[PDB]
Each structure stands twice: as C-alpha cells, then as structure tokens.
C-alpha cells in the first residue's frame, strides 16, 4: 500500500540544525501534499509544515517560520525538512504525513522519528545478559532477558533473535535514572529444554549513537 | 488563534460501554473535524474525517457527531483493542489544529495478581564495577501496583528506579524496578527482596549471590 519512511532521528544540540527525510512510495507523489506533524511528550500533535510537491511552496506553522525548510526532490519522491536553530522545546517525534487539498487531514502517517535537542553527549548502551536459571524458572518456563544500560538519548529497540523470537517479549519502556541516562530491559520466557537446544541473542539498536549489540544470553 | 478544547482528559471504561468524548471549536469549523487514535509505538491513525466519515476499516463501533463547534466522538460498545489516546483535530483553518488528547483506559476486566522475576547482577555487570538487580512484574490486572526493596529483612530506598505499568495485551500488564548497588554490597548481604504489592496484597522474590 502508501509507504511513507522517515530517516533523520536523533539527538541536536540547541541551537543546532538537523535534516529529517521522508520517503514516499505507493501513490502519485505530485497528486499530494505532504506534511510533517510532530508530537513533543506531555503536548499533543502538532502540525509542522506543508509542502506542494509540484511548486515546492511551502507553509509553515508559526513558530517553524523562518526556522524550518520544507524541500522535495521528486526524482527519488522524498520530502526534505531542514531544522535550524533548534530549542529544547522542539524535542518530539517527527511525522511525514499526507493531505488532499485543502483539507489538512491525514489518512497516511510515517513511523516517526524521535528527534532530541539536549546539551548532553550521545552515549551507547552497555548491555548485559539476564541469565536464565532454575531460580528464574516457574512450571518449566524459564525467564531470560537482556538489561540495556546507561544511553543517551532514547530511543532503543530490542528484537531477539534477529526477529525469529517474538511470543512471550516483554520489552520495558526506559527509566530515567539520576545520571541523566537512560536504561531499559526486555525479558522473554520459554520452555526449559530449549535452553540447552535454542541459542537466545538480543539485538539492541540504538540508533542515535549509530550503535547495534547483539547479546549472547547463556543459561548459567 | 483557534483553539480545540477536548474534554475529558482522560476515563476508564468497562468493556461494552458506552463512551463519549467531546471537542469545542472556538469558532465555526463546519464539518471540518477529523478524530484519530494514537496507541503506544505506533503512528496515529484516522478514524473519522467530515465530523462523521468513518475511514476505511474502523470499526462501526465508532461514530462522529456535531457541526459548527461542538463535536462528539462515540465508541457504542467499548472494546479491549480500544485502549489508547484520542484526538480531535480541525483541518481547515490553519493551523489545522489538534486538540490535546483523551486517554481511554479499560476498567473492570479480570483480576490477575502479578508474577515477579527477579535476575540478579550478570557476572560480566559485576567484573565492570556494577551491579543492578532487576525484578520483572508481569501478567497483572488492574495496572498498579507498589515496588519495596529489602537487602536482608530491612527496607532500602537509594538506587531504585521504577517503570509506571504498561499494557502488554488486551488484558495484562508488565512493570520493572532497578535496584542499583556496588558489587561489594550485593556480595556482602545473605540475600535481596523485591516485594510487589498489588491490591493490597504482596508478592516477594528473593535472590543471593
Ligand atoms: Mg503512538
């Protein structure tokens, strides 16, 4: 169906610049317009700007005046949103979106993409095995898991078993700690025999710091 | 300049309720108001446009009311799948702008008091100067619950860190809780607790070195 696949994510000092993309596919690009809507934690949605495909004209709510650039290139049907001079106030997911004509509603959205505007340093996480164990298992499911420590800004995914390993996922949201980094887990429970026979590896990316691990997790 | 205002905030509702959510425009907006749902993760997603169009796909459960300033979104018989945020916007004037939100939470399903695992610091945490135990609470309803730590028999309150509970499923919830020590203390006390309280009841997980 209409694909739309931002890249750009990641932490910006204030006052810095960041350039978000968003690839479209699925739909004439040029019968469009095609928005950016972002969503800041606390607040609500927010539209951004908008941009004719065609004309490459743009508008752009208030507070983006100025700031924001709106560009397309439709040889390869992406839209461009340039940020400059960015605040703390400014961190939010970032969605591309769709709208026809002069109703501003939106039936196609992105995946977003959590741009964070801080003073402090990216940091990968460091990620460490939850052993399985008889002393984690309960009626023969035994719990094994991987802790993701001390990263800088969120956010991470965890997948197990490069996406093989999905039932029976718990992966937490993040705690902020007193550091100012972040840290989550994710904990799956399978049978006890298939520990000895199933090789369990978590698959943490964190991708603000350009950063994958891909952690061994070995009954003890 | 022109405000949507949604009310309320937020509300929990049985399943099969009926549940009603309000939005004013501060000025005529016609039928020019779209209603979204936004879950955890994910984008949002359309479920009404022209007051009362339901989009492709959404269920009939769903209905959109109201012209001028006054618009009502309607879910007839509240479902588990229905947990999540919902938002009015307006889209023609700009800044085509969304109200803040109404968190839809679902009361009154079965009760499920909580399992609790608890991992101990990783030999490869302990050999880098760290040590964190980390207690995993899943499988509960409804989603609150209270964390307490014990080194030994007694209370300790520095270094712990807790997740406000998450929906799992339809039905459940999961939390953790972090509990940060020096490898001298982990190896230097005979044991360390994590006590789940839920409901007025407790569960507590025990490990040692
Ligand atoms: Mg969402």
């Known amino acids: 169906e209409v694909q739309l696949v931002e890249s750009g994510g990641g932490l910006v000092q204030p006052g810095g610049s960041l350039r978000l993309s968003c690839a479209a596919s699925?739909?004439?690009?040029?019968?469009?317009?095609m928005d950016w809507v972002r969503k800041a934690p606390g607040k609500g949605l927010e539209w951004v700007a908008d941009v004719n495909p065609n004309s490459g004209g743009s508008i752009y709510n208030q507070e983006f005046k100025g700031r924001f650039t709106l560009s397309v290139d439709r040889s390869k049907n992406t839209l461009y949103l340039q940020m400059n001079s960015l605040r703390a106030e400014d961190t939010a997911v970032y969605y591309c979106?769709?709208?026809?004509?002069?109703?501003?509603?939106?039936?196609?959205w992105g995946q977003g993409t959590l741009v964070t505007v801080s003073s402090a340093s990216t940091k990968g996480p460091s990620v460490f095995p939850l052993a399985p164990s008889s002393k984690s298992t309960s009626g023969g499911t035994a719990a094994l898991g991987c802790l993701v420590k001390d990263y800088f800004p969120e956010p991470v995914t965890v997948s197990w078993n490069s996406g093989a390993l999905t039932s029976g996922v718990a992966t937490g949201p993040a705690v902020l700690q007193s550091s100012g980094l972040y840290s989550l887990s994710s904990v799956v429970t399978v049978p006890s025999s298939s520990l000895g026979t199933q090789t369990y590896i978590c698959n943490v990316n964190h991708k603000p710091s350009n950063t994958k691990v891909d952690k061994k997790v070995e009954p003890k | 300049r022109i405000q949507m205002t949604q009310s309320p905030s937020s509300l929990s509702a049985s399943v099969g309720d009926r549940v009603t959510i309000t939005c004013k425009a501060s000025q005529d907006v016609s039928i020019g108001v779209a209603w979204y749902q936004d879950k955890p993760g994910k984008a949002p997603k359309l479920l009404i446009y022209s007051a009362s169009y339901r989009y492709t796909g959404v269920p009939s459960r769903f209905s959109g009311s109201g012209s001028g300033t006054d618009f009502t979104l309607t879910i007839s018989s509240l479902q588990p799948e229905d947990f999540a945020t919902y938002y009015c916007q307006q889209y023609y004037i700009y800044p085509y702008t969304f109200g803040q939100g109404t968190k839809v939470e679902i009361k009154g399903q079965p009760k499920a008091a909580p399992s609790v695992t608890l991992f101990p610091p990783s030999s490869e945490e302990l050999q880098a100067n760290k040590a964190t135990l980390v207690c995993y609470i899943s499988d509960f309803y409804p989603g609150a619950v209270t964390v307490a730590w014990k080194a030994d028999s007694s209370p300790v309150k520095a270094g712990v860190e807790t997740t406000t509970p998450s929906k799992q499923s339809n039905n459940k919830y999961a939390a953790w809780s972090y509990l940060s020590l020096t490898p001298e203390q982990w190896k230097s006390h005979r044991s360390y607790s994590c006590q789940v309280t839920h409901e007025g009841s407790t569960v507590e997980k025990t490990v040692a070195p």
């Open positions: 979106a769709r709208n026809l004509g002069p109703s501003f509603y939106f039936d196609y």
């Open positions: 699925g739909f004439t690009f040029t019968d469009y317009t």
